Amino acid sequence: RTMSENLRRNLAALEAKISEAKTKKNMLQARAKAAKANAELQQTLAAAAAAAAAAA
Amino acid sequence: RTMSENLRRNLAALEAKISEAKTKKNMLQARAKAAKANAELQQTLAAAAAAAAAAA
């Protein structure tokens, strides 16, 4: 019964760090999607506008 | 939120130089139309009047 207290805390501590990893996963996946869009939009707009305007 | 201030200024600065280019476009197109008419009128009138008058 002293081992089952230890196991019940270890089981709760394991799911607590699995739970933490899952929230971190979503925030990291979001930043990567946002950063991919920021780079494409900024570079595409700046390059296309400047090149077309100068040539014309 | 510091990136969205930067993007909101860059978006306003882009449309400001597109706006400037559009006003310049109209003034340049006008001068080219005027210059084409000035040349044709001056040369046509001077040449036709002098040649016909001298021959007659």
From Swiss-Prot, chains A, B:
Disruption-associated phenotype: Essential, it cannot be completely disrupted. Cells with very low levels of protein have no ordered thylakoids, are barely green and are non-photosynthetic.
Compartment list: Cell inner membrane
Stated family: Belongs to the PspA/Vipp/IM30 family.
Function description: Required for thylakoid formation.
Protein's UniProt name: Membrane-associated protein Vipp1
Residues of the full protein shown: 112 to 155 of 267
